[PDB]
Design an enzyme around this catalytic site. Structure first.
Site, short mmCIF file in Angstrom:
data_model
loop_
_atom_site.label_atom_id
_atom_site.label_comp_id
_atom_site.label_asym_id
_atom_site.label_seq_id
_atom_site.Cartn_x
_atom_site.Cartn_y
_atom_site.Cartn_z
N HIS G 202 0.83 -1.10 0.33
CA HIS G 202 0.00 0.23 -0.81
C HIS G 202 1.48 1.30 -0.28
CE1 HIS G 202 -3.28 2.84 1.41
NE2 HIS G 202 -3.55 2.13 0.81
N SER G 206 1.69 -1.15 -6.91
CA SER G 206 2.34 -2.35 -7.58
C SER G 206 3.38 -2.05 -8.88
CB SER G 206 1.30 -2.74 -9.01
OG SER G 206 0.46 -3.74 -8.14
C1 HEM Z 1 -1.35 -16.82 0.05
C2 HEM Z 1 0.56 -15.79 -1.29
C3 HEM Z 1 -0.38 -14.66 -1.61
C4 HEM Z 1 -0.49 -13.54 -1.36
C5 HEM Z 1 -2.46 -13.44 -1.22
C6 HEM Z 1 -0.86 -12.52 -2.29
C7 HEM Z 1 -0.60 -11.51 -2.66
C8 HEM Z 1 -0.48 -10.74 -3.02
C9 HEM Z 1 -1.41 -9.57 -3.72
C10 HEM Z 1 -2.89 -8.57 -4.20
C11 HEM Z 1 -0.63 -8.89 -4.54
C12 HEM Z 1 -0.49 -7.18 -5.56
C13 HEM Z 1 -1.98 -8.04 -6.50
C14 HEM Z 1 -0.26 -8.54 -7.91
O1 HEM Z 1 0.98 -7.50 -8.06
O2 HEM Z 1 -0.86 -9.91 -8.90
C15 HEM Z 1 1.01 -9.24 -4.41
C16 HEM Z 1 2.11 -8.63 -5.36
C17 HEM Z 1 3.06 -9.34 -4.59
N1 HEM Z 1 3.80 -10.52 -4.05
FE1 HEM Z 1 2.13 -11.77 -3.34
N2 HEM Z 1 0.97 -12.46 -2.28
C18 HEM Z 1 1.61 -14.60 -2.22
C19 HEM Z 1 2.66 -14.45 -2.31
C20 HEM Z 1 3.94 -14.05 -2.66
C21 HEM Z 1 5.06 -15.06 -3.11
C22 HEM Z 1 4.85 -16.88 -2.31
C23 HEM Z 1 5.92 -13.73 -2.76
C24 HEM Z 1 7.66 -14.01 -3.47
C25 HEM Z 1 8.27 -14.78 -3.09
C26 HEM Z 1 5.21 -13.03 -3.68
C27 HEM Z 1 5.93 -10.79 -3.78
C28 HEM Z 1 5.26 -10.16 -4.28
C29 HEM Z 1 5.54 -8.85 -4.97
C30 HEM Z 1 6.99 -8.71 -4.61
C31 HEM Z 1 4.57 -8.79 -5.75
C32 HEM Z 1 4.90 -7.03 -5.93
C33 HEM Z 1 5.05 -6.87 -7.40
C34 HEM Z 1 4.29 -6.33 -7.75
O3 HEM Z 1 4.18 -4.97 -7.51
O4 HEM Z 1 5.09 -5.09 -9.67
N3 HEM Z 1 3.92 -13.41 -2.72
N4 HEM Z 1 0.91 -10.24 -4.01
C1 LIG Z 2 -2.67 -3.83 -5.75
O1 LIG Z 2 -3.84 -3.65 -5.77
C2 LIG Z 2 -4.63 -4.61 -5.16
C3 LIG Z 2 -5.23 -5.20 -6.25
O2 LIG Z 2 -5.05 -4.98 -7.82
C4 LIG Z 2 -5.64 -6.62 -5.58
C5 LIG Z 2 -6.26 -7.57 -6.93
C6 LIG Z 2 -6.00 -6.97 -4.75
C7 LIG Z 2 -7.08 -7.83 -3.61
C8 LIG Z 2 -6.50 -9.96 -3.64
C9 LIG Z 2 -7.03 -9.72 -2.95
C10 LIG Z 2 -5.47 -11.03 -2.52
C11 LIG Z 2 -8.02 -9.96 -1.10
C12 LIG Z 2 -7.09 -9.82 0.11
C13 LIG Z 2 -7.04 -10.98 0.64
C14 LIG Z 2 -7.66 -11.07 1.70
C15 LIG Z 2 -8.33 -10.59 2.60
C16 LIG Z 2 -7.07 -13.13 2.40
C17 LIG Z 2 -7.24 -13.37 3.92
C18 LIG Z 2 -8.52 -13.80 4.58
C19 LIG Z 2 -9.07 -15.30 5.05
C20 LIG Z 2 -7.80 -16.25 4.69
C21 LIG Z 2 -9.93 -15.58 5.55
C22 LIG Z 2 -10.26 -17.14 6.24
C23 LIG Z 2 -11.26 -17.32 5.94
C24 LIG Z 2 -11.94 -18.15 7.61
C25 LIG Z 2 -11.27 -17.77 8.19
C26 LIG Z 2 -13.64 -18.14 6.97
C27 LIG Z 2 -13.33 -19.62 8.53
C28 LIG Z 2 -14.68 -19.97 8.26
C29 LIG Z 2 -15.91 -20.64 8.94
C30 LIG Z 2 -16.21 -19.13 10.14
C31 LIG Z 2 -17.00 -21.16 8.09
C32 LIG Z 2 -17.24 -22.20 9.61
C33 LIG Z 2 -18.59 -21.93 10.28
C34 LIG Z 2 -19.31 -22.97 10.72
C35 LIG Z 2 -21.18 -21.98 11.20
C36 LIG Z 2 -19.08 -24.53 10.03
C37 LIG Z 2 -5.98 -5.58 -3.64
O3 LIG Z 2 -6.42 -6.23 -2.19
C38 LIG Z 2 -5.37 -5.05 -4.21
O4 LIG Z 2 -5.22 -3.41 -3.00
C39 LIG Z 2 -3.82 -4.08 -2.32
#
Ligand code: HEM
Ligand SMILES: COc1c(O)c(C)c(C/C=C(/C)CC/C=C(\C)CC/C=C(\C)CC/C=C(\C)CC/C=C(\C)CCC=C(C)C)c(O)c1OC
Ligand SMILES: CCCCCCCCCCC(=O)OC[C@H](COP(=O)(O)OC[C@H](O)COP(=O)(O)OC[C@@H](COC(=O)CC)OC(=O)CCC)OC(=O)CCCCCCCC
Ligand SMILES: CCCCCCCCCCC(=O)OC[C@H](COP(=O)(O)OC[C@H](O)COP(=O)(O)OC[C@@H](COC(=O)CC)OC(=O)CCC)OC(=O)CCCCCCCC
Ligand SMILES: CCCCCCCCCCCCCCCCCC(=O)OC[C@H](COP(=O)(O)OCCN)OC(=O)CCCCCCCCCCCCC
Ligand code: HEM
Ligand code: HEM
Ligand code: HEM
Ligand SMILES: COc1c(O)c(C)c(C/C=C(\C)CC/C=C(\C)CC/C=C(/C)CC/C=C(/C)CC/C=C(\C)CCC=C(C)C)c(O)c1OC
Ligand SMILES: CCCCCCCCCCCCCCC(=O)OCCCOP(=O)(O)OC[C@@H](O)COP(=O)(O)OCCCOC(C)=O
Ligand SMILES: CCCCCCCCCCCCCCC(=O)O[C@H](COC(=O)CCCCCCCCCCCC)COP(=O)(O)O
Ligand SMILES: CCCCCCCCCCCCCCCCCC(=O)O[C@H](COC(=O)CCCCCC)COP(=O)(O)OCCN
Ligand SMILES: CCCCCCCCCCCCCCCCCC(=O)O[C@H](COC(=O)CCCCCC)COP(=O)(O)OCCN
Ligand SMILES: Cc1cc(C)c2nc(SCc3c(C)cccc3-n3nnn(C)c3=O)sc2c1
Ligand SMILES: Cc1cc(C)c2nc(SCc3c(C)cccc3-n3nnn(C)c3=O)sc2c1
EC number: 7.1.1.8
Lengths: 62, 54, 385, 51, 126, 49, 385, 126
Positions: G202, G206
């Site tokens: 943030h 990107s």
């Molecule tokens: C559960 C795993 C992960 C989640 C939810 C996650 C989430 C994100 C998101 C939402 C973005 C911005 C959108 C995008 O750039 O496509 C991002 C960017 C990025 N992620 Fe991840 N990521 C994960 C794993 C990783 C891993 C494993 C690495 C590196 C080893 C990584 C490195 C980066 C970097 C460097 C960026 C910036 C890329 C850019 O802005 O050009 N992330 N990540």
């Molecule tokens: C660069 O600009 C971007 C951007 O390009 C994008 C795509 C996204 C959006 C991308 C995402 C990956 C979204 C953000 C991810 C999360 C909020 C994931 C984290 C949350 C979880 C893992 C929640 C886990 C789920 C639970 C805890 C639910 C538990 C289950 C229950 C309660 C069911 C059980 C109930 C009963 C009654 C059995 C941005 O936010 C963003 O700004 C930074």
């Protein structure tokens, strides 16, 4: 009255203000309260990792 | 002098609070695993494994 | 600027527990919210180590708790901490919420702080129920029977909600295997509600025992309220030591050391001591639909308190009629807890009926009448007309 | 003028060193705190002359 | 939130009534001393919460010689609380200087707010 | 079966912690000595102000 | 201001997924980070419902997975989603990290973004190991035997670490009861590392496929990149449907449908397909201390890449020698995965020895020599001297 | 992070050498056309990353008639990328106008940084 006239602090003040008097007794007590918190905190982390060892009925099947 | 001996040096003030705690646990566990024994004698196992020697 | 206010993550630590501007006037009642961050760390940590030696089947449940207590190295230290610590979790939280309605912080601008705190209290009652059903003792079977039978009173919905809550036709083996899996999860939902709870505090800060504003005399967090914090943290772990090592079974029922039997019924089925005032409210209404509505709308009666205080001064420091009715509400929550561990007899059904009305006349009839009389008595005592 | 530093300010060569021989006498001494209760290589601790 | 307008409407009716103001005015006097806010060196208008947009208006319009003397009564009370003592009896507000210095600025910031909403919800007809 | 072992570890902690609690009351009331003894005095400004 | 930027919690939603300034130039490779927030929601939700019907004892483990698959209502939908979904979790994450070293985002000012991402990749490998040991099939016994035997090579520490990791003297019943309790927890540590991962994004935003700054032409998130998001989310759940309903056992080993036996050994012990390139690196070093060091210092070789790029242009868009060596590193991670599912034979021991050297010569010898040759070739091609 | 002082030190040595600059200069020319940055309407000094305190200095000292024409070449390139096309061959930078407009401002912001650290780590003696 004026701001160049400080109030009296001799009701709370020491009578011999040597600098090392309060610089020693305020590091012996903070020294003592960082010694029991280092031995009383290694024994707690060790109790939680001794439970993952071999259980008493597993040592009987040795 | 006394303040600049072991209280000025934090490397000592982190060291000696750690070094003192190593010998603290051992002179104090032995001191209380000889008070618990002496307070309760005639009720341990080593005491009654000496009148069953017959 | 320094490194602690330049880094991304350290400036989150610096804005909360180092340089957060605190009032100069707060006393030792503002420490109960700090113990609850330690209370939640203890209960999660001791429970992950006890989850390595536990079996959630109904024929293995009252033998994995004993395998912990007799065979696991220092396993009795883990359990007695996780059974007296949860009763310490609740004594602090009853004193946390009681401070916040004395100094009356629920008011503007802190109403979101009071509303996310009521959600935490609902989710905390639910974990202590779901985990006490995992021992599968004799109190652990007939406590899940009585509570889950209440959801059959919902008209046209009832017997298809209980049979989904049971996984069968009574408190069976699928009932105990689903109650452990929900016991692991809701402590991780409480921790995400505490992070949202601290965010709503950072934008307005704490109150003070005077009630008036405190932006004229402030003190940082470091070296003053951290060394005022550790006075009560060393007192907390000292009375958490005099129970786990000297009286580890005083806060408990002996019937939980009998394995649970669906064929023999105990002579008394009573809850753990912190669900006792809410037990006497359910038993006081002679209907199983109007009894389950009343007990759920007694944790949710706290939300009407921001709209019911009619006073212009915040907090019950200089209010001598609003202080006499705070200590009637306290000893009424104690008489309600005593009656929930009695028998259904005379006069413990009319005493639990009057005293569950004083639980509701406080928030709705006693607060707005007395907080309006005081606004006139602070006026005609001064104004010469 | 053109003397010793890279990314570190190397004028702290032994203006960093002899006290972290004593922080090394305070962090390896920190490993002389958590090695207790773990009687595996604590033969390297329990040969001291008192108690 | 019980409106000063409404507090003064009820309060004037008791003070105008000669038979009601022999019942409520001694109860109003024991309620003031048992509150004990004078012993901490405060008048009553210091105690009022200021976190609404009417009390923020009534504090700007206050004269600066009164605005400076009120910031000192608050700071002197935060220090008496911390030491857990009370001020001496030479620094207690007497029964003559506890007067409303903020009620004139409050009552006209409210009456101007009860005209801006009456003129925005209005059913004039031809 | 833990009854004799439990009450022996029940003196390792209540001797450490009751001493560790007594030091934190000395240490707190040393660093809280400046704030508890501050003085204040009001000279009202000149009547223009 | 509007309500979405005035509220405490809605302004956190507004600053991230509504009005976050995005570059105008990003393509469909910036969507893989959004799927991983959906991939982690699926694996947590389907696993809490499967944890209601599971028994972690070693004599009940290969019968509670089958009780789910034939007796639980739609229980085969839950399992096949939680076994093909984790292999979908990894194919996106291999494409997420490969984008970020093409465009080269690891550079300044995004180095904390790259360092908290390496921690997530270590904790993701650990959950897929700990949960595949909970089926207790035949691959699930000899996979935990081979890996936990590596920790005996630590000198003077070894056989007191394995006996603490086993709870006994081999892969016993306390080994399976502690691996399930750690399988519930580490998915909740990954979710707290993703929240810290979004915070470091943030403050800088990107990158873009051009590499140059993008503060001159920006577009908000709503109505453009939310409707560009849903193109790939509907493609994700469509190929997650053609596996769970048509080929639910292609990504798996048939030996995991035999219960695990500590007395008969399989003819081949091979991992799940996404741990295969890291398996060939361990088997390539003929020592069990220098083999466990090498495989752990192959996930941690990514941290030296911010200090090894010597170029002045960011990203491999206009770099034609740094593009030929990105696609040598890709097909070397595929040849390493193929060899980890072969036999220890000729020539699959010299092929896995050369190709685990090209895994290390990239980050340390190939990057700084080629990213320095280009800095001179962009200079003497222009400057007339 | 290689330094243009060091890039220019190596680069001048190849250009002064008459036998080295018949080996490296045709390889330097095919590397430019295969980069393809001219087809998007950009010079090479547009491509340089600006997120360090030396490139932030060299951009302030740039004249404003050049500072405005560079903000348009960047915006024209972000739109050519989004439509996935290329600009026409009437809007490509030719081989004569691709000159370093930023290298004089860069090389003197570096030499002033290699004097502030040499004068702060210094061992003068009497
Ligand atoms: C559960 C795993 C992960 C989640 C939810 C996650 C989430 C994100 C998101 C939402 C973005 C911005 C959108 C995008 O750039 O496509 C991002 C960017 C990025 N992620 Fe991840 N990521 C994960 C794993 C990783 C891993 C494993 C690495 C590196 C080893 C990584 C490195 C980066 C970097 C460097 C960026 C910036 C890329 C850019 O802005 O050009 N992330 N990540
Ligand atoms: C660069 O600009 C971007 C951007 O390009 C994008 C795509 C996204 C959006 C991308 C995402 C990956 C979204 C953000 C991810 C999360 C909020 C994931 C984290 C949350 C979880 C893992 C929640 C886990 C789920 C639970 C805890 C639910 C538990 C289950 C229950 C309660 C069911 C059980 C109930 C009963 C009654 C059995 C941005 O936010 C963003 O700004 C930074
Ligand atoms: C399950 C429990 C786990 C442990 C949690 C304990 C909960 C404590 C909550 C009680 C509380 O916070 O009220 C504070 C109340 C006085 O209010 P105050 O802040 O204005 O006074 C500060 C003092 O002047 C300065 O105290 P000072 O800093 O000078 O010394 C500290 C003092 C004890 O420190 C504490 O932690 C007290 C809690 O040390 C000693 O007294 C020496 C003893 C050898 O202190 C009291 O003594 C009132 C006791 C009645 C409360 C009963 C309620 C229980 C239901
Ligand atoms: C198991 C994992 C499943 C997860 C879901 C699928 C993951 C997709 C990952 C692939 C990817 O993201 O690369 C995107 C890249 C698009 O390049 P670009 O953004 O510059 O041009 C946008 C276009 O002009 C406008 O595309 P437009 O919006 O006009 O039309 C829609 C588009 C389909 O949308 C998509 O999601 C495509 C991925 O139509 C198509 O493009 C037809 C494709 C079916 O596509 C390519 O260049 C193809 C490269 C091959 C990918 C190899 C992957 C190896 C595993
Ligand atoms: C959803 C339902 C909500 C239920 C929540 C209700 C739970 C009730 C449980 C009782 C525990 C709470 C005790 C009260 C704590 C809040 C009171 C408080 O914040 O302080 C009030 C008062 C402060 O007085 P001062 O210190 O300011 O006096 C100085 C003079 N200027 O402090 C005092 O004067 C000290 C008075 C101490 C009263 C002790 C009563 C506690 C009895 C507990 C019995 C336990 C049985 C298990
Ligand atoms: C807010 C957090 C928690 C609270 C208030 C809580 C409360 C309780 C209580 C009161 C009991 C009954 C103890 C008894 O009478 O024997 C219990 C049992 C149990 N709880 Fe916790 N718990 C919490 C968190 C956890 C977590 C995160 C786990 C994760 C594994 C866990 C695991 C267990 C287990 C295994 C039992 C089995 C019975 C026993 O071993 O005593 N608890 N819980
Ligand atoms: C796990 C549970 C909780 C935690 C960790 C927690 C934490 C905190 C903390 C640290 C504070 C700071 C001020 C102080 O320390 O007293 C606070 C204040 C507050 N809490 Fe909690 N709390 C919890 C539960 C609750 C509950 C159950 C309620 C109400 C139903 C609540 C309502 C409040 C209010 C109103 C305040 C503001 C008090 C003031 O600033 O004067 N909290 N909380
Ligand atoms: C990042 C999150 C997760 C990943 C990558 C993951 C991965 C896996 C994998 C690959 C398996 C083996 C599937 C098979 O081949 O049969 C498995 C098994 C299992 N996992 Fe998950 N898991 C995750 C989260 C969870 C969570 C949070 C839970 C508990 C609520 C859970 C519960 C289970 C259970 C009960 C099994 C039993 C074997 C089965 O039913 O197939 N998983 N996990
Ligand atoms: C008023 O002023 C204050 C203030 O007084 C205080 C105290 C705080 C401090 C904040 C708190 C006390 C909040 C408390 C936070 C929590 C309770 C979150 C903790 C949540 C967790 C889930 C922690 C537990 C995490 C784990 C990973 C459990 C550990 C398990 C392990 C290590 C597994 C063990 C097994 C192996 C193999 C190692 C403030 O921020 C603040 O400013 C507002
Ligand atoms: C369509 C897409 C999907 C939908 C997604 C919805 C919208 C997505 C947006 C994602 C939002 C992510 C934003 C990150 C976030 O929540 O920020 C953190 C919140 C701020 O509060 P906090 O300071 O963390 O709490 C308060 C904390 O900082 C308290 O810290 P403290 O306890 O003081 O210090 C730690 C202890 C150290 O103590 C020691 C050791 O001394
Ligand atoms: C995460 C922490 C949860 C546990 C804290 C709960 C405290 C109340 C119950 C006490 C349990 C301690 C069990 C006794 C033990 O294991 O060792 C006992 C004795 O050790 C002690 O006396 C330590 C007592 C002091 C503990 C509290 C001090 C806190 C210091 C900071 C800790 C932060 C990590 C075993 O002694 P041993 O060394 O011979 O093996
Ligand atoms: C909201 C719930 C999320 C969970 C809690 C959120 C965070 C609460 C605080 C947690 C403790 C964090 C303290 C870490 C301080 C480390 C200093 C640092 O970050 O230096 C970072 C580099 O750190 C890394 O490489 C990644 C570390 C991963 C951290 C994982 C814990 C560099 O700092 P920086 O680049 O800003 O310094 C420039 C000065 N001119
Ligand atoms: C969860 C991980 C932490 C990471 C950062 C947190 C991300 C925030 C999640 C998004 C939450 C969206 C909330 C938008 C609506 C908030 C409206 C509001 O201000 O409510 C406040 C207070 O109510 C609440 O506490 C609700 C909190 C929502 C938490 C959900 C359990 C106003 O309440 P209300 O408008 O209903 O009027 C009072 C009548 N009872
Ligand atoms: C909102 C809400 C939710 C729940 C879930 C709830 N539950 C109870 S009372 C349960 C009980 C009984 C009736 C008898 C014996 C023992 C236990 N029992 N079960 N767990 N614990 C800690 C107990 O004391 S009121 C209540 C209120
Ligand atoms: C850092 C790290 C950690 C772990 C824990 C790890 N583990 C492996 S390989 C395990 C394995 C084998 C050797 C043989 C058959 C099956 C499985 N196996 N076990 N789980 N899964 C998904 C499997 O494929 S490399 C690796 C690297």
């Amino acid at each position: 009255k004026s701001t160049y006239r400080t109030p009296n602090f001799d009701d709370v003040l020491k009578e011999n203000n040597d600098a090392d008097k309060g610089r020693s007794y305020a590091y012996f007590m903070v020294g003592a309260m960082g010694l029991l918190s280092s031995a009383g905190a290694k024994s707690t982390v060790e109790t939680f990792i001794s439970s993952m060892t071999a259980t008493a009925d597993v040592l009987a099947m040795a | 002098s006394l303040y600049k001996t072991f209280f000025k040096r934090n490397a000592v003030f982190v060291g000696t609070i750690f070094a003192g705690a190593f010998v603290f646990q051992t002179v104090f566990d032995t001191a209380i695993t000889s008070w618990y024994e002496n307070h309760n004698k005639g009720k341990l196992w080593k005491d009654v494994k000496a009148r069953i020697a017959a | 600027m320094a490194f602690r206010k330049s880094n991304v993550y350290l400036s989150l630590v610096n804005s909360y527990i180092i340089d957060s501007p605190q009032p100069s006037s707060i006393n030792y009642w503002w420490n109960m919210g700090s113990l609850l961050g330690l209370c939640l760390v203890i209960q999660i940590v001791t429970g992950i180590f006890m989850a390595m030696h536990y079996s959630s089947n109904i024929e293995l449940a009252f033998s994995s708790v004993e395998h912990i207590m007799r065979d696991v190295h220092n396993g009795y230290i883990l359990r007695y901490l996780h059974a007296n610590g949860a009763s310490f979790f609740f004594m602090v939280m009853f004193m946390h919420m009681a401070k916040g309605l004395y100094y009356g912080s629920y008011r503007s601008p802190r109403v979101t702080l009071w509303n996310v705190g009521v959600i935490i209290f609902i989710l905390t009652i639910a974990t202590a129920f779901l985990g006490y059903c995992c021992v599968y003792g004799q109190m652990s079977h007939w406590g899940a029977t009585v509570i889950t039978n209440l959801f059959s009173a919902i008209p046209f919905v009832g017997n298809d909600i209980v049979s989904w809550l049971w996984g069968g036709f009574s408190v069976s083996n699928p009932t105990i295997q689903r109650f452990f899996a929900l016991h692991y999860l809701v402590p991780f939902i409480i921790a995400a509600m505490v992070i949202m709870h601290l965010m709503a505090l950072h934008i307005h800060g704490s109150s003070n025992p005077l009630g008036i504003t405190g932006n004229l005399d402030r003190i940082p967090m470091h070296s003053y309220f951290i060394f005022k914090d550790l006075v009560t943290v060393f007192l907390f772990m000292l009375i958490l030591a005099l129970f786990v090592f000297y009286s580890p079974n005083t806060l408990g029922h002996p019937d939980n050391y009998i394995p649970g039997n669906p064929l023999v019924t105990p002579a008394s089925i009573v809850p753990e001591w912190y669900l006792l005032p809410f037990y006497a409210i359910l038993r006081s209404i002679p209907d199983k639909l109007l009894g389950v509505i009343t007990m759920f709308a007694a944790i949710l009666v706290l939300l009407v308190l921001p709209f019911t205080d009619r006073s212009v001064v915040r907090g019950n420091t200089f209010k001598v009629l609003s202080k006499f009715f705070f200590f009637i509400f306290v000893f009424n929550f104690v008489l309600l807890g005593q009656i929930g561990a009695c028998h259904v007899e005379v006069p413990y059904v009319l005493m639990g009926q009057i005293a569950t009305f004083i639980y509701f006349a406080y928030f709705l009839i006693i607060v707005p009448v007395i907080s309006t009389i005081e606004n006139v008595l602070f006026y005609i005592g001064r104004v010469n007309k | 003028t053109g003397l010793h530093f890279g990314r570190l300010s190397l004028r702290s060569l032994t203006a960093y060193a002899p006290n972290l021989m004593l922080w090394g006498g305070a962090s390896m001494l920190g490993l002389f705190v958590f090695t207790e209760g773990w009687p595996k290589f604590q033969d390297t601790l329990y040969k001291k002359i008192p108690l | 939130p019980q409106s000063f307008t409404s507090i003064a409407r009820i309060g004037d009716y008791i003070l105008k009534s000669p038979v009601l103001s022999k019942l409520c005015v001694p109860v109003a006097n024991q309620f003031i001393n048992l509150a004990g806010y004078k012993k901490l060196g405060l008048k009553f208008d210091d105690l009022i919460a200021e976190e609404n947009p009417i009390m923020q208006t009534a504090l700007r319009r206050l004269p600066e010689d009164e605005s400076y003397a009120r910031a000192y009564r608050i700071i002197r009370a935060h220090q008496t609380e911390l030491t857990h003592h009370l001020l001496p009896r030479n620094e207690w507000i007497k029964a003559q200087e506890d007067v409303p210095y903020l009620l004139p600025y409050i009552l006209e910031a409210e009456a101007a707010a009860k005209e801006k909403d009456e003129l925005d919800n209005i059913e004039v007809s031809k | 079966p833990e009854h004799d072992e439990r009450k022996r570890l029940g003196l390792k902690t209540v001797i450490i912690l009751s001493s560790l609690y007594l030091l934190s009351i000395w240490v707190k009331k040393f660093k809280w000595a400046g704030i508890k003894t501050r003085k204040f005095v009001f000279n009202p400004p000149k009547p223009r102000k």
